[PDB]
Structure formats: structure tokens, C-alpha cells
Design a protein around this ligand. Structure first.
Ligand SMILES: *C(=O)CCN1CCN(CCC(*)=O)CC1
Ligand SMILES: [Ca+2]
Ligand SMILES: [Ca+2]
Ligand SMILES: [Ca+2]
Ligand SMILES: [Cl-]
Ligand code: NA
Ligand code: NA
Ligand code: NA
Lengths: 5, 473
């Protein structure tokens, strides 16, 4: 995914 | 005489204070009278439980918005797995209410706290830009515990709208003094990731924060790189204690972990610092962090002394934050001069990399011109190169004062043949050095394979001033 926690 | 908080879990917040010296020295700032009154912090994440019994008294709707659903209410989405607990945990580290019989306390327990709900959905360039640019004359400090994938093969950073939001924030935000952006440096340790391959942490406009365990070691998840600025405590092995904060469904947790917990603690310490001097610029704040952070008893094999006598590590930056020292130094701080920028295009022709390449260049740093720099802040080596397996490369940069920065370490999982396209590797390790003189760039193949490629552009970009220096440590 483009951005992760 | 200062009375420390009476909250039921405050005794378990080992990282805020104690006799043992393994803390962030936050009670010393509280006793000087700084608790965060008047400062506004926003958590850019998956939402904030605005009615939590330990957040409601400090909650600020002017610091909040729901970008994912396009409404003003940032309440998280409730699910059986409690996936959207992450932003609430980060917020309590900053500004959980004190002396109210509930859970523990925030670092800045009298500050105002909001949240931007922006991770619960597809995170586009426009979504990032709208969050970073929210209410910039009301919010003082933005905290972000997210970023590009930590798989150890990604090279990615802010796209056009998000980069525009960073420049608008530091230029016109906070009355022209500049928004403060705090970033978690990453969780890619197990993949041997480099936080210089992450454009958010690598930016000069963010304070990138790494982690240390309770016993003072480099945690399993930590990423090393030259762009990190400083460190706060977080989790480690199962014999080491963890972070205490507010949890989803009005609960309290003692098991908050990872890079995610380090950036909010730094944001809270910066909030105390701004209360002590509301006139500090975005660049002032980074100077204060460089001068006051503490290496002592953090274990690493790469501690080095730079050209002005400060110890610096790729795992920790300049060391652990020290809240008491930050607020003391802030009170009589003299604003730094306007920022200068000196651009030096190094190459006269392309160079084959082969097994090893060394590029040497003596520079004057814009001598005789209005952008002459004798006192460096950030430095960048902007590199364009082709190569057949990117993760086999290691890249180092040496300053004229002899400080060796690792711009890129080997990345075993990075098989890309795409190279680097004007990627702006950044180092904080030569801060306050004179950048006039010989710079050295080294690129090497760390594997036995017969790799091949070409370096086609190398721009050295220097930022800083020509005044105000201190006697080296
Ligand atoms: C936190 O972001 C909320 C939970 N969830 C995680 C994964 N999801 C994307 C899944 C991929 O399509 C975003 C939100
Ligand atoms: Ca909503
Ligand atoms: Ca409390
Ligand atoms: Ca990373
Ligand atoms: Cl610039
Ligand atoms: Na400005
Ligand atoms: Na940064
Ligand atoms: Na020199």
C-alpha cells in the first residue's frame, strides 16, 4: 500500500 | 515546590522521570513551569477519540479534520479488530490530562490536542497535502507516525502537492515563523531499510526521530541513516518496559510500541519548548535539538565526533532529547539569521561506477556572494545514477572537517534496476561546520557480483548562515 502506520 | 502528577499509571511512565537517569528529563521542565499551556498539536493519523476521558479536557476541534470522509469530525472508525486505535495512542503521549484519576499523563499535559483522520482510506498526494496544510495559523506542531513501506526496497517521498505543503508551512505558517513537522524515522530494521530512502524523514523541513530501548540499545525495528536528528525512548525486548497511553474505547494501555511512539514524545517536548519562547522559528527549533541532545549511555558501534566536537550516530542522531535543557536554552535564544542556499554542480562528465568510484571536489561555498555559507546546517548530495542492482550500492560523503556520513548502506532486498533520479540524500552530521574545502563522495559495490552503471549528476547543496557560531564542544 502507498502509506503504512 | 512542584507537585508531580497523581494519575494511577504515572509511576509506570519510566521514560518521563526517575532517579536512574534513563529518562527524557521531562519533570525538570514541568518544575520550571512549562506544561504546554497555549500550544496546539495535531496528530496526522487514523483519527482521535475526542471523547476519551483522558483527552476530552484538552481536545481542540480547530486542530482536527476528517480528510478521508470530508467532514470536521475525526472520530475513528470502530471495528472488531480495533485497527483504528493508532492515532488515539499517539495523542495521549502528547497531551493526556494530568491529575484526573485516569491512566497517565502527556508530556505536555496542558497543551491543546487535535487529530486529522487521513490514513483510513487511500492515501493520495492530495490527501497528504490537505492534512499537512490544515489551519496553519492555529496549529503549531504536526506529528506523523506513518510513511512509505518499510520493505527495504522502496525509494519514495512526497509528491508535488505534499512538497508544496511543506514549503508553504515553513515559509508562511505560524505567523511566518514556520510550521513544526515531526516524523517517525521508520520500522524497517528487520529488512535492513535505510531512512534516507524515505523522502519524508530525509526532508530538511521535518525533525526525524529514532528510538532507544529502556536499557539503552538500538531496537530491532530501528532504521539507520544520516538524516535522523535525535532520539526518544520506545519499546525493545520483552524484559524492557513500553509506553503508557490512551487507548481506543476509553481504555488505557501500557503496551504502545515501535517507531510510532517516538515521534509523539518528541512533539510533546517541542511543545514545552515553544511555551518557553513562542518566537522560535522552525530552524531555531532544530538548532536547539542539536545543541541539547544527549549521547550518554546509548550503545552503538558507530559513535563519531564531528568537526565541532559533537558526538553523532546514524542510529540516534545527536542522542536523546532532554526536555529540561531544551526549555532552559529556549528562554534567551537569539533568532538565527535568514537561511542561505549554495548550489555546487560537481561533475564535468559522467563516470562509470564499476567496483568503486571516488569523486573529490574543493569548493568555496559561494565565497564573495550573498549566499556565502561559513556555518552549515543541512547538506544534500543530489545524485542521478544508473545501476543494475540498487541494493548492492553503499554511498558515503566526507566533509572538509573530516566527518564521514553514510548516505546509503547496502539493502539486501533492493533488487531494482531503476537507479536514483536526482535523489537528495541528506545529512545532519556536519551541523555548524565550515563547509569550505574538499568534499569526497564514495560509491562502492558491496557484493562480489559484476555489477555496472554510471553516475551522471552530483549536485552538492549547502544550507546555513555566515554568523553566530559557538566555541566547539
Ligand atoms: C488504519 O489505517 C486503518 C485500517 N486499515 C488498514 C489497511 N487499509 C488498507 C488496506 C488495503 O487496501 C487502510 C486502513
Ligand atoms: Ca468523520
Ligand atoms: Ca490522566
Ligand atoms: Ca523506511
Ligand atoms: Cl530550497
Ligand atoms: Na517566513
Ligand atoms: Na527530516
Ligand atoms: Na575548509
Amino acid at each position: 500500500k502507498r502509506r503504512v502506520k | 515546590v512542584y507537585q508531580e502528577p497523581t494519575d494511577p499509571k504515572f509511576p509506570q511512565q519510566w521514560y518521563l522521570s526517575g532517579v536512574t537517569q534513563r529518562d527524557l528529563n521531562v519533570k525538570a521542565a514541568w518544575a520550571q513551569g512549562y506544561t504546554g499551556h497555549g500550544i496546539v498539536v495535531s496528530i496526522l493519523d487514523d483519527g482521535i477519540e475526542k471523547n476519551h476521558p483522558d483527552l476530552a479536557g484538552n481536545y481542540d476541534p480547530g486542530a482536527s479534520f476528517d480528510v478521508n470522509d470530508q467532514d470536521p469530525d475525526p472520530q475513528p472508525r470502530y471495528t472488531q479488530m480495533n485497527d483504528n486505535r493508532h492515532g488515539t495512542r499517539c495523542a495521549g503521549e502528547v497531551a493526556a490530562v494530568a491529575n484526573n484519576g485516569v491512566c497517565g499523563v502527556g508530556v505536555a499535559y496542558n497543551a491543546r490536542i487535535g487529530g486529522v483522520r487521513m490514513l483510513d482510506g487511500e492515501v493520495t498526494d492530495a490527501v497528504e497535502a490537505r492534512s499537512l496544510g490544515l489551519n496553519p495559523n492555529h496549529i503549531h506542531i504536526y506529528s506523523a507516525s506513518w510513511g512509505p513501506e518499510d520493505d527495504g526496497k522502496t525509494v519514495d517521498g512526497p509528491a508535488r502537492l505534499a512538497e508544496e505543503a511543506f514549503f508553504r508551512g515553513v515559509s508562511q505558517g505560524r505567523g511566518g515563523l514556520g510550521s513544526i513537522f515531526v516524523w517517525a524515522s521508520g520500522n524497517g530494521g528487520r529488512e535492513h531499510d535505510s531512512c534516507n530512502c524515505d523522502g519524508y524523514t530525509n526532508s530538511i523541513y521535518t525533525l526525524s526521530i529514532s528510538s532507544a530501548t529502556q536499557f539503552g540499545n538500538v531496537p530491532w525495528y530501528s532504521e539507520a541513516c544520516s538524516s535522523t536528528l535525535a532520539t526518544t525512548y520506545s519499546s525493545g525486548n520483552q524484559n524492557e518496559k513500553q509506553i503508557v497511553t490512551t487507548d481506543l474505547r476509553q481504555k488505557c494501555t501500557e503496551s504502545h510500541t515501535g517507531t510510532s511512539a517516538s515521534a509523539p514524545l518528541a512533539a510533546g517536548i517541542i511543545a514545552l519548548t515553544l511555551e518557553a519562547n513562542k518566537n522560535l522559528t522552525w530552524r531555531d527549533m532544530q538548532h536547539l535539538v542539536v545543541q541539547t541532545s544527549k549521547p550518554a549511555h546509548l550503545n552503538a558501534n558507530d559513535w563519531a565526533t564531528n568537526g565541532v566536537g559533537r558526538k553523532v550516530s546514524h542510529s540516534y542522531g545527536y542522542g536523546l532529547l532532554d526536555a529540561g535543557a531544551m526549555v532552559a536554552l529556549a528562554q534567551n535564544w537569539t533568532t538565527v539569521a535568514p537561511q542561505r542556499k549554495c548550489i555546487i554542480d560537481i561533475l564535468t562528465e559522467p563516470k562509470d561506477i564499476g567496483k568503486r568510484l571516488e569523486v573529490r571536489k574543493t569548493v568555496t561555498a559561494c565565497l564573495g556572494e550573498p549566499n556565502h555559507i561559513t556555518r552549515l546546517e543541512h547538506a544534500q548530495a543530489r545524485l542521478t545514477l544508473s545501476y543494475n542492482r540498487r541494493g548492492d550500492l553503499a554511498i558515503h560523503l566526507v566533509s572538509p572537517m573530516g566527518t564521514r556520513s553514510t548516505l546509503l548502506a547496502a539493502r539486501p532486498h533492493d533488487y531494482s534496476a531503476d537507479g536514483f533520479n536526482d535523489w537528495a540524500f541528506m545529512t545532519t552530521h556536519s551541523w555548524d561546520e565550515d563547509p569550505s574545502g574538499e568534499w569526497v563522495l564514495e560509491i562502492e559495490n558491496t557484493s562480489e557480483a559484476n555489477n555496472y552503471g554510471t553516475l551522471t549528476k552530483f549536485t552538492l547543496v549547502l544550507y546555513g548562515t555566515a554568523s553566530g557560531s559557538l566555541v566547539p564542544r
